[PDB]
Amino acid sequence: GVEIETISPGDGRTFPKKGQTCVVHYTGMLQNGKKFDSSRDRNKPFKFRIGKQEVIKGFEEGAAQMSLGQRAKLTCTPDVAYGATGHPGVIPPNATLIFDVELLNLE
Amino acid sequence: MDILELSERLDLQRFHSHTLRLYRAVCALGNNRVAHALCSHVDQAQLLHALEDAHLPGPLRAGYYDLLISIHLESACRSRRSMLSEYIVPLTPETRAITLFPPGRKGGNARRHGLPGVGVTTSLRPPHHFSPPCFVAALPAEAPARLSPAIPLEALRDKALRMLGEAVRDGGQHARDPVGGSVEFQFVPVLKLVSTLLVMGIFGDEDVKQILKMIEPEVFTEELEEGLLQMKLPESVKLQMCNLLEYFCDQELQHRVESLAAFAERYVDKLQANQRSRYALLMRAFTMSAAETARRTREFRSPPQEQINMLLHFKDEADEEDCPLPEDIRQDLQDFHQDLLAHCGIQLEGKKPQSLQELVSHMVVRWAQEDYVQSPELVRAMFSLLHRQYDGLGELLRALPRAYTISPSSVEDTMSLLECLGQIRSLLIVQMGPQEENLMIQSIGNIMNNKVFYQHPNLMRALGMHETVMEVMVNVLGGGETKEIRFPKMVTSCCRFLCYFCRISRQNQRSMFDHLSYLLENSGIGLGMQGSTPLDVAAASVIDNNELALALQEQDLEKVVSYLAGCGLQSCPMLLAKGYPDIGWNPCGGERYLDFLRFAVFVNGESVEENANVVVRLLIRKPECFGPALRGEGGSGLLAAIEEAIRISEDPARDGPNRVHLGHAIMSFYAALIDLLGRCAPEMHLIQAGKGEALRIRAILRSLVPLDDLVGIISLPLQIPTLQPKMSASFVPDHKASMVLFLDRVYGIENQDFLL
Amino acid sequence: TPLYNLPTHRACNMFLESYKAAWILTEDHSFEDRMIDDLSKAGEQEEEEEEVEEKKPDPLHQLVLHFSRTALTEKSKLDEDYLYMAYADIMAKSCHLEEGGENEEVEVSFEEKEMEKQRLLYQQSRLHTRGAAEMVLQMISACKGETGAMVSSTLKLGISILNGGNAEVQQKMLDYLKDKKEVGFFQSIQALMQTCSVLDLNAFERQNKAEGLGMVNEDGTVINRQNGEKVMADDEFTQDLFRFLQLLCEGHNNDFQNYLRTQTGNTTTINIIICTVDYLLRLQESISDFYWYYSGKDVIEEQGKRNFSKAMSVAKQVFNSLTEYIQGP
Amino acid sequence: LVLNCIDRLNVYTTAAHFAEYAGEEAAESWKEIVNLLYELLASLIRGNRANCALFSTNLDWVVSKLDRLEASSGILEVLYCVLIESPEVLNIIQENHIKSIISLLDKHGRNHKVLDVLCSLCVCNGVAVRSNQDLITENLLPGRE
């Protein structure tokens, strides 16, 4: 269900592997909508790790199919993602999501 | 469209201001869920840019400022202000290194005697505990889920501070284009922001020094720039400035009380050391005479409060002490007293103010010497401030009881307790809900199981946890006197906590007993299910008897017996509504009553007559409060009634059928009645010898109830659990034992009734 | 057990609580007159020289007007308002500093007596007789049933005003009443008079045996050690109430006294005198019931005599009041 | 009686010829009459609380009444009036009410009055209410349309 469309700077080899803290300076976007989040404004590029069910698994499956230094535009299916009711007050249900991503992964 | 076109559109400007008001409101005080939710529609950098802007339509600047305050700081400031006027301390060397603190040319107590916005004070002040904003994290399925959306504070502080200086310099020039066409939109909600941060304790000492140096010359630190205050200004800025100055007054007071405790610990240490040496040379090196006995009468024959009291009156007087103490530690207290007065607003004789108090006392009257002052909030603020800076010692006396010093090695537990208390005070104002009562109960269980609540109960008496718990209890209970009793089972736990609080004391029982009529008024809406009932904790008040039941007031007793009159009239709809036979009254209600009245007189053995006489008199005056099966208006047999009760209890076809048995409750009700009446004996062997009035009460009693049926009640045995077992859901051995106390107190076997 | 071999934190708590040889409770007297005169002096601020044919209010006048404003607003009850209570005690102590304190062989001169009539009446005008007279009387419309300390503070302020005569402020009060044209004052007054304490004997027995039962241990006996506010408990309230009603018609007005009898422009009529007499009836009835108790005895207990003193002083004030209604026929 | 008058007079969607079952010359005045009626129903309530409290039975009625043609004037005004002095009617909400209000905002456009109404709906005085509050946050569509 997850489908990547990568702008490919970076090495394109070092995938973020398990037991590792991947750090993405990201920003979201909605399907024919507008923004709802950005690490860029807050100046804390989202230091989290993989396989822990912290983020939704659409973002994790995107995190698996990437590398260091690259740049992708990550579609996100609602049943994979929040969308059966959505994050209330912030996201409605059936939310098909989009994410810009730029990262280093110090493991 | 760029936002600055609202200055000429004028129709969406108002709409955006009202949308902004909606975001301010629906980000309610103490709703941090919605606060984290709100940072998607807006953005921290967007708010920063709006904050930093100079071009606007006016109101939207203030609303954006206030929305920022609503989101990131409101819960913090409110929870801080709840625990603000509560002057406790642990003992550390930081605590010890505190005084007035004038250093300088050896005249600083007479000279510039330090400042507020100063360094260490070592109170106990729980932090804010933000949570960082985010949205992509998956949900949890409960929990608070959200603390408060976070933000940087220090860069924000520097930003606000340079903004303050910039606005001051812009207003100094008397511009014809203020920020928003009006100086009030330029000296403005920035004032609210700095005040909120200041209350929230963000600021370093250099920061508060800087924003005091904004008011430079009247302060005039030891080491044109016209300050902010002396210039002519509108009214709302005066309101915010007084709301600023209250902080510095509070800080001076806080430093004052902490300096007092710093004096106090070293003083009590050296004083008890000198007392130990004095007792040593008295007892160990007596060479005994009458003076040795006179000195020895103090220690064993006086409690320590009386001992320190007498010691202190020796420690100072009008040269009429008759003192044991050396006249060296009487002098350091004297100089301490004088320096403390000097910190207060008394020159002690017995323009440039160079202080806060003379400054503000001149300044506020200078304001009133300006034009007629509307906006009575400003009036109350100004005069409260003014009254404080004259009777400041009086405010310290108001702060004396609220303070409480403790040692360390408990602060780790107290901080959890205080954070729980802040959660109570956050849940106070909000209307009740399921997660609220769950969190309430979780905090309640957190605090009872700490041992420090038990270790320092007078401290809780000073705070007033009990009245707050009572307030929320009547909030959940009240409103719906009989219709809306939504959200119980926190009432149970809180009432249990109040029972505990009343238990471990000598005056928490007193501190509830004052509120007792309200507690009975709410007990009128109790009277239903099991659990910690309001009347149960009411009964928990006065069982530490012989100081309170004497000082009790009659007004509650007509209340409880009228409740019992309704108990004898009303069939308990709460327990009739489950397929039950609709008896004209409820034994369960009267049994839920009268353990209170038993506890009026129970442990205090052979209790009093001033209470019992009015009790039995009001009771006989309303005979319907009795079982009318027994004491009805006509044919009403006792043993007839218990035979009917046993026929109903052993035959549940004519009984209701949850987990409640009728005839069990009936015999239990009459058992509690006769146990009361035995404990409501008209006298004991003291005065029945030497009185007739108590024998009048005995005569009324015996005219009401005869013998030859209590012995019939003894003639009602029960089987044994052997093959095989039994269950005590129907009949009770302890309740055949209930008439025994009554019979013993009233009649007394002579020769032959013992044999029978 | 001694003071030492004790935890030092509980020791310092007991020290600060038990601080009576050097409590804060000493004379200060540096927040009353120097306080008050500054306001009326600033109200004549020479820098505030407009000459607009209507001089702006003074700070004191603004204060009194704020309290009258929050008085006159409508609701059932009142808050505690510690500010009002504080400033009321301040003002009453200021004007009463001439009355009390200022008034062995202290043989004063007639000249100095005349000097001491003044320094009160100046303090009366400094109080704004102008505003405060209407303020204190506007309040009692609001505090209408409660025995609040707010109420007692207002009454004490009225006593501090009216002490030596002051027919001026009597006239101003009367004119305010006959312009307001208002029930609420007198009915509140009769409700107050209806709720004032007298002697009780059951309570006397209870507290007497309780003081007899001084078997409380350490940190359990000083809480209810005295407990003397159990039986009457309303001397400083009730005596001041009757003294106020006396002190209106001290000077033989002969029109105020008629208005105390009756209320013409208002709808209803009260005759507060009747309430005075009913209170006196209940009071002496309680005193006779007190008598018949001790009549079996020949000697009287000390606390009983001590209560009898205040009970007689109450009726003394009442008799002085009833004289001052009609002394002046 | 006035509510019954309004009710029997409510049942007129256009009131042009549907009010002309008594013919013309009364249908003309019908709009002015009903506007004045809601005006008086606002006038009797401002500042009162006893009159305010009674609409706990009548709340779903009035929020469903909303005849769309003489209602943005005065029905919303009385709704603003009653939802200030009375927290007893504040706390009885069914979640269709705010949805109808939001649809009214959509169908009548950007009015600040509705926003002040919800600002009052969140809080009576001091105490907040969380259920309807979170309902308002989620029904404020973060689709942002």
Coordinates of N, CA and C in Angstrom, one line a residue, chain D residues 12-96:
Chain D
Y12 N -45.3 27.5 8.7 CA -45.5 28.4 7.5 C -44.1 28.6 6.9
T13 N -43.8 27.8 5.9 CA -42.4 27.8 5.5 C -42.1 29.0 4.6
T14 N -43.0 29.4 3.8 CA -42.9 30.7 3.0 C -43.8 31.8 3.5
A15 N -45.0 31.4 3.9 CA -46.0 32.3 4.5 C -46.4 33.4 3.5
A16 N -46.3 33.1 2.2 CA -46.7 34.0 1.1 C -48.1 33.8 0.7
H17 N -48.3 32.5 0.1 CA -49.7 32.0 -0.1 C -50.0 30.9 0.8
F18 N -49.0 30.3 1.5 CA -49.2 29.3 2.5 C -49.8 30.0 3.8
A19 N -49.4 31.2 4.1 CA -50.1 32.0 5.1 C -51.4 32.6 4.6
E20 N -51.6 32.6 3.3 CA -52.9 33.0 2.7 C -53.9 31.8 2.6
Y21 N -54.1 31.2 3.7 CA -55.3 30.4 4.0 C -56.3 31.3 4.7
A22 N -55.8 32.4 5.3 CA -56.6 33.6 5.6 C -56.4 34.7 4.6
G23 N -56.0 34.3 3.3 CA -55.8 35.2 2.3 C -54.7 36.2 2.5
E24 N -54.5 37.1 1.6 CA -53.6 38.2 1.7 C -54.0 39.2 2.8
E25 N -53.2 40.2 3.0 CA -53.3 41.3 3.9 C -53.1 40.9 5.4
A26 N -52.7 39.7 5.7 CA -52.2 39.3 7.0 C -50.9 38.5 6.8
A27 N -50.7 37.8 5.7 CA -49.4 37.2 5.3 C -48.3 38.3 5.1
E28 N -48.8 39.5 4.7 CA -47.8 40.6 4.5 C -47.2 41.0 5.9
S29 N -48.0 41.2 6.9 CA -47.6 41.5 8.2 C -46.9 40.3 9.0
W30 N -47.0 39.1 8.4 CA -46.6 37.9 9.1 C -45.1 37.9 9.5
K31 N -44.3 38.4 8.6 CA -42.9 38.4 8.8 C -42.5 39.4 9.9
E32 N -43.1 40.6 9.9 CA -42.8 41.6 10.9 C -43.3 41.1 12.3
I33 N -44.4 40.4 12.3 CA -45.0 39.9 13.5 C -44.1 38.9 14.2
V34 N -43.6 37.9 13.4 CA -42.8 36.9 13.9 C -41.5 37.4 14.3
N35 N -40.9 38.4 13.6 CA -39.7 39.0 14.0 C -39.8 39.7 15.3
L36 N -40.9 40.5 15.5 CA -41.2 41.1 16.8 C -41.4 40.1 17.9
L37 N -42.0 39.0 17.6 CA -42.2 38.0 18.6 C -40.9 37.4 19.1
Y38 N -40.0 37.1 18.2 CA -38.7 36.6 18.7 C -37.9 37.8 19.4
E39 N -38.2 39.0 19.0 CA -37.6 40.2 19.6 C -38.0 40.2 21.1
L40 N -39.3 40.0 21.3 CA -39.8 40.1 22.7 C -39.4 38.9 23.5
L41 N -39.2 37.7 22.8 CA -38.7 36.6 23.4 C -37.3 36.7 23.8
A42 N -36.5 37.6 23.1 CA -35.2 38.0 23.6 C -35.4 39.0 24.7
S43 N -36.3 39.9 24.6 CA -36.4 41.1 25.5 C -36.8 40.6 27.0
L44 N -37.6 39.6 27.1 CA -38.0 39.1 28.4 C -37.0 38.4 29.2
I45 N -35.8 38.1 28.6 CA -34.9 37.1 29.1 C -33.5 37.8 29.5
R46 N -33.2 38.9 28.9 CA -31.9 39.5 29.2 C -31.8 40.0 30.6
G47 N -30.8 39.4 31.3 CA -30.5 39.6 32.7 C -31.2 38.7 33.6
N48 N -32.4 38.2 33.2 CA -33.1 37.2 34.1 C -32.3 35.9 34.1
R49 N -32.6 35.1 35.1 CA -32.2 33.7 35.2 C -33.3 32.7 35.4
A50 N -34.3 33.1 36.1 CA -35.5 32.2 36.3 C -36.1 31.9 35.0
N51 N -36.4 33.0 34.2 CA -36.9 32.9 32.9 C -35.9 32.1 32.0
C52 N -34.6 32.3 32.3 CA -33.5 31.6 31.5 C -33.6 30.1 31.7
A53 N -33.8 29.7 32.9 CA -33.6 28.3 33.3 C -34.6 27.3 32.6
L54 N -35.8 27.8 32.3 CA -36.9 26.9 31.9 C -36.6 26.2 30.6
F55 N -35.7 26.6 29.8 CA -35.6 26.1 28.4 C -34.9 24.8 28.3
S56 N -34.6 24.1 29.4 CA -34.0 22.8 29.4 C -35.0 21.8 28.7
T57 N -36.3 22.0 28.8 CA -37.2 21.2 28.0 C -37.4 21.7 26.6
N58 N -37.1 23.0 26.4 CA -37.4 23.6 25.1 C -36.2 23.8 24.2
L59 N -35.0 23.2 24.6 CA -33.8 23.5 23.9 C -33.8 22.9 22.5
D60 N -34.0 21.6 22.4 CA -34.1 20.9 21.1 C -35.1 21.5 20.2
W61 N -36.2 22.0 20.8 CA -37.3 22.7 20.0 C -36.7 23.9 19.4
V62 N -36.1 24.8 20.1 CA -35.7 26.1 19.6 C -34.5 25.9 18.6
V63 N -33.6 25.0 18.9 CA -32.5 24.8 18.0 C -33.0 24.1 16.7
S64 N -34.1 23.3 16.8 CA -34.7 22.8 15.6 C -35.7 23.8 14.9
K65 N -36.0 24.9 15.6 CA -37.1 25.8 15.0 C -36.6 26.5 13.8
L66 N -35.6 27.4 14.0 CA -34.7 28.0 13.0 C -35.2 28.1 11.6
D67 N -36.3 28.9 11.4 CA -37.0 29.0 10.1 C -36.2 29.7 9.0
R68 N -35.0 30.1 9.2 CA -34.0 30.4 8.2 C -34.2 31.7 7.4
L69 N -35.4 32.4 7.7 CA -35.8 33.6 7.0 C -36.0 34.8 7.9
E70 N -36.4 34.6 9.1 CA -36.6 35.6 10.1 C -35.9 35.3 11.4
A71 N -34.8 34.5 11.3 CA -34.2 33.8 12.5 C -32.8 34.3 12.7
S72 N -32.1 34.6 11.6 CA -30.7 35.1 11.8 C -30.7 36.5 12.5
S73 N -31.8 37.2 12.4 CA -32.0 38.4 13.1 C -32.1 38.1 14.6
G74 N -33.2 37.4 15.0 CA -33.6 37.4 16.4 C -33.6 36.1 17.1
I75 N -33.8 35.0 16.4 CA -33.7 33.7 17.0 C -32.3 33.4 17.5
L76 N -31.3 33.8 16.7 CA -29.9 33.7 17.2 C -29.7 34.6 18.3
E77 N -30.3 35.7 18.4 CA -30.1 36.7 19.4 C -30.6 36.2 20.8
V78 N -31.8 35.6 20.8 CA -32.3 35.0 22.0 C -31.5 33.8 22.4
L79 N -31.0 33.1 21.4 CA -30.2 32.0 21.7 C -28.9 32.4 22.4
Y80 N -28.4 33.6 21.9 CA -27.2 34.1 22.6 C -27.6 34.6 24.0
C81 N -28.8 35.1 24.2 CA -29.2 35.5 25.5 C -29.3 34.4 26.5
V82 N -30.0 33.3 26.1 CA -30.3 32.3 27.1 C -29.1 31.5 27.5
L83 N -28.0 31.4 26.6 CA -26.8 30.6 26.8 C -25.7 31.3 27.6
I84 N -26.1 32.2 28.5 CA -25.1 33.0 29.3 C -25.5 32.8 30.7
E85 N -26.8 33.2 31.1 CA -27.2 33.2 32.5 C -27.5 31.8 33.0
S86 N -27.5 30.7 32.2 CA -28.0 29.4 32.6 C -27.0 28.3 32.2
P87 N -26.2 27.9 33.2 CA -25.5 26.6 32.9 C -26.4 25.3 33.0
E88 N -27.6 25.4 33.5 CA -28.4 24.2 33.6 C -28.9 23.8 32.2
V89 N -29.1 24.7 31.3 CA -29.4 24.4 29.9 C -28.1 24.2 29.1
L90 N -27.0 24.6 29.7 CA -25.7 24.4 29.0 C -25.4 22.9 28.8
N91 N -25.7 22.1 29.8 CA -25.1 20.8 30.0 C -26.0 19.6 29.5
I92 N -26.9 19.9 28.6 CA -27.9 18.9 28.2 C -27.9 18.6 26.7
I93 N -26.7 18.6 26.2 CA -26.6 18.7 24.7 C -26.5 17.3 24.1
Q94 N -27.0 17.2 22.9 CA -27.2 15.9 22.2 C -26.3 15.7 20.9
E95 N -25.5 16.7 20.6 CA -24.5 16.8 19.5 C -25.1 17.0 18.1
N96 N -26.4 16.8 18.0 CA -27.1 17.3 16.8 C -27.2 18.8 16.8

